[PDB]
Design a protein around this nucleic acid. Structure first.
Ligand SMILES: [Mg+2]
Ligand SMILES: [Mg+2]
Ligand SMILES: [Mg+2]
Ligand SMILES: [Mg+2]
Ligand SMILES: [Mg+2]
Ligand SMILES: [Mg+2]
Ligand SMILES: [Mg+2]
Ligand SMILES: [Mg+2]
Ligand SMILES: [Mg+2]
Ligand SMILES: [Mg+2]
Ligand SMILES: [Mg+2]
Ligand SMILES: [Mg+2]
Ligand SMILES: [Mg+2]
Ligand SMILES: [Mg+2]
Ligand SMILES: [Mg+2]
Ligand SMILES: [Mg+2]
Ligand SMILES: [Mg+2]
Ligand SMILES: [Mg+2]
Lengths: 124, 185, 55, 141
RNA sequence: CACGGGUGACGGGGAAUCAGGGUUCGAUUCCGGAGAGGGAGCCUGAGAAACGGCUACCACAUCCAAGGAAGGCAGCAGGCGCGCAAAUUACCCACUCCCGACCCGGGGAGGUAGUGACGAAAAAUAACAAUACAGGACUCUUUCGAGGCCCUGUAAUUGGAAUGAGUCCACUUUAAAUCCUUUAACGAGGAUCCAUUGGAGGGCAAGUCUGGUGCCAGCAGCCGCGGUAAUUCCAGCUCCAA
């Protein structure tokens, strides 16, 4: 009962991807999750689901239609090459550290106080 | 410097005399006849109709066969024909001056739902619009001041997720069956 | 002299307010107002009376 | 106009410029004598400390005591008899209270019965005098 | 109309009001200028008379062992003061761009949230049906009355029907969230899930209603009201405007 069509298709050779406007129709349930989107783009274009990156859904008022964006790369050695790191961290293949931004600025102003090799020994 | 618009416009004008007995005699007929919510709804249709007439007087002072007066004149007629306030043979810019407020309140979706006969009363129709019962071309419209164009008039019907259409019953009848099945066992 | 400040408001008979069925508000208030203005009453002879005209 | 010639625009503009000063509403705005004389100073409100409560006799035919308040402002130190509007609202005002003082609505003019009061009291120790009158708030003690 | 003086004078694009003319505003996100507590002088540099650069003096001000040392929030948050008068010591470089030796680093520029009735736009607070009833174009009846093809309205009379506001999982959103939208489960009859703010003599929409006061208290923008029967105060009911 979930039908997904694509609009505005384009092949990026200089970005090694496909691109389209994903048009999901779900009259009768919630906005269907992006894990279920990628598996259905997998069987539609006959490709693996790991080269599929899908984002940007806003459901219409009334709710029988959405609109999203999607790109489908060639391999993961392109899909990790030209792709934002925050959308590589969604699935689980990228990890940022847990030092927050205020702890980074506070140390950089303390490392600015100290001259020489002891800059490595300022924090901890 | 922040990247945001700040372009906004008031859509109504309060009148110059506050307590005319005759203006209140006139404008309160417009709320009863067409199921409106306040005087600001009357005051905003008069202000849109004043804008169209004000651009109408500005084109009539131009010379005939002016390169601006033809293009702006043809566009303003087409914008009144497509909403269905001006007659499709009457489209001539000298007839825009002979046009009144009750013609816009017809093409309001609240009165179209009433005149299409899928509403019980004018005040029943606004309850239907607010409770998301009706749609216009596969699009559930929640707002009664929707100016229905002439192109999209024959597509007003009940929304697909509505018990007044072909859908599930509401909160009430689901509870009335649950106390009925609770009563029998 | 300022000895008489709050004279009358202090010495009035303290009347408790009457409970009442609440008024409808919005287009429903304006609808009930429209019905009591136009659709109910008829034109009759003589000088007509007011909305609160009591006697 | 009287001189209608085609290049008399300096005779006309400098005659409106001269004769605007004989307008009473214009000169009060454009000379600094009236903004200096205004106890607020081009402000709409002013906090001031009460120093005594003053009874003002009303004018002709009306025969009453108008319950006013001698206010000294904070921003200037200027002394003012301000009025206290509603019935019995003088009893809320104690001495040495910061009261907020507005105009009376007549733009520097004595209003009605009261001789020489241009100002009325809005709030009494950061509580409005309306809510004290109605009973929505209470005087903070 | 020089020169001098005042400006509650940064200029302009522009804003408010407007028949036509005009009048007033423009510190404020775009362009140009000026300044970094006050003046002054310099160094480096393509470019500064630079202040998140130095050097003095004046003002203010911090540490001290009394010898000295350090400073510039009209950047972003915040605090005091001044006031009639104005927000969080939040999250992130993901967006827009900038800079650098640079695809990688950094950016309180900027983006996103928190306070926000400055202001603008959309827009709920019921709808329907049946009983009494009050009426209307028919038909009948001299009137009195009456039948319902058809209405319109009112009533803490009754009835189930529709829904959000909210509660709350889940997606979606997003740098990560929050919100909107989508969605199960709950969620409404005095639908207590209760709409106020001003007024009712005239201007000016709307009571010569009732009780208290008795030129007092007070109302009153103006004219005026109150002197023991107040259409004007103080209250209740009612009505009126948004
Ligand atoms: Mg007089
Ligand atoms: Mg100056
Ligand atoms: Mg200046
Ligand atoms: Mg400017
Ligand atoms: Mg400079
Ligand atoms: Mg400073
Ligand atoms: Mg400098
Ligand atoms: Mg600085
Ligand atoms: Mg700088
Ligand atoms: Mg403010
Ligand atoms: Mg960035
Ligand atoms: Mg980078
Ligand atoms: Mg900023
Ligand atoms: Mg409510
Ligand atoms: Mg009264
Ligand atoms: Mg009046
Ligand atoms: Mg009247
Ligand atoms: Mg009055």
């Amino acid at each position: 009962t979930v039908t997904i069509r694509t609009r505005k298709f384009m092949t990026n050779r200089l970005l090694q991807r496909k691109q389209m406007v994903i048009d999901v129709l779900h009259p009768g349930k919630a906005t269907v999750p992006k894990t279920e989107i990628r598996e259905k783009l997998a069987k539609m274009y006959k490709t693996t689901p790991d080269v599929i990156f899908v984002f940007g859904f806003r459901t219409h008022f009334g709710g029988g239609k959405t609109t999203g964006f999607g790109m489908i790369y060639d391999s993961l050695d392109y899909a990790k090459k030209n792709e934002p790191k925050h959308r590589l961290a969604r699935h689980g293949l990228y990890e940022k550290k847990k030092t927050s931004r205020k702890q980074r600025k506070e140390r950089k102003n303390r490392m600015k106080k100290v001259r020489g090799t002891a800059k490595a020994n300022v924090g901890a | 410097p922040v990247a945001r618009s700040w372009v906004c416009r008031k859509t109504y004008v309060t009148p110059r005399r506050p307590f005319e007995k005759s203006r209140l005699d006139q404008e309160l007929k417009l709320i009863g006849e067409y199921g409106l919510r306040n005087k600001r709804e009357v005051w905003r249709v008069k202000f849109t109709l004043a804008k169209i007439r004000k651009a109408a007087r500005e084109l009539l002072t131009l010379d005939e066969k002016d390169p601006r007066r033809l293009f702006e004149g043809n566009a303003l007629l087409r914008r009144l024909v497509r909403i269905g306030v001006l007659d499709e043979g009457k489209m001539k810019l000298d007839y825009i001056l002979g046009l009144k407020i009750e013609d816009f309140l017809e093409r309001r979706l609240q009165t179209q739902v009433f005149k299409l006969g899928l509403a019980k009363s004018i005040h029943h129709a606004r309850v239907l619009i607010r409770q998301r019962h009706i749609r216009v071309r596969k699009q559930v419209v929640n707002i009664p001041s929707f100016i229905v164009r002439l192109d999209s008039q024959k597509h007003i019907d009940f929304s697909l997720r509505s018990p007044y259409g072909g859908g599930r019953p509401g909160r009430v009848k689901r509870k009335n069956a649950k106390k009925g099945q609770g009563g029998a066992g | 002299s300022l000895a008489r400040v709050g004279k009358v408001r202090g010495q009035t008979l303290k009347v408790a307010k009457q409970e009442k069925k609440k008024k409808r508000t919005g287009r429903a208030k304006r609808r009930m107002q429209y019905n009591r203005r136009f659709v109910n009453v008829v034109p009759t002879f003589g000088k007509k009376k007011g909305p609160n005209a009591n006697s | 106009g009287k001189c209608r010639g085609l290049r008399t625009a300096r005779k006309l503009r400098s005659h409106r410029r001269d004769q605007k000063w004989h307008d009473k509403q214009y000169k009060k705005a454009h000379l600094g004598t009236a903004l200096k004389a205004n106890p607020f100073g081009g402000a709409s409100h002013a906090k001031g400390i009460v120093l005594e409560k003053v009874g003002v006799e009303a004018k002709q035919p009306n025969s009453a005591i108008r319950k006013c308040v001698r206010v000294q402002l904070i921003k200037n130190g200027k002394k003012i008899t301000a009025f206290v509007p509603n019935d019995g609202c003088l009893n809320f005002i104690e001495e040495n209270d910061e009261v907020l003082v507005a105009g009376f609505g007549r733009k520097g003019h004595a209003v009605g019965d009261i001789p020489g009061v241009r100002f009325k009291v809005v709030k009494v120790a950061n509580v409005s005098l309306l809510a004290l009158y109605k009973g929505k708030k209470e005087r903070p003690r």
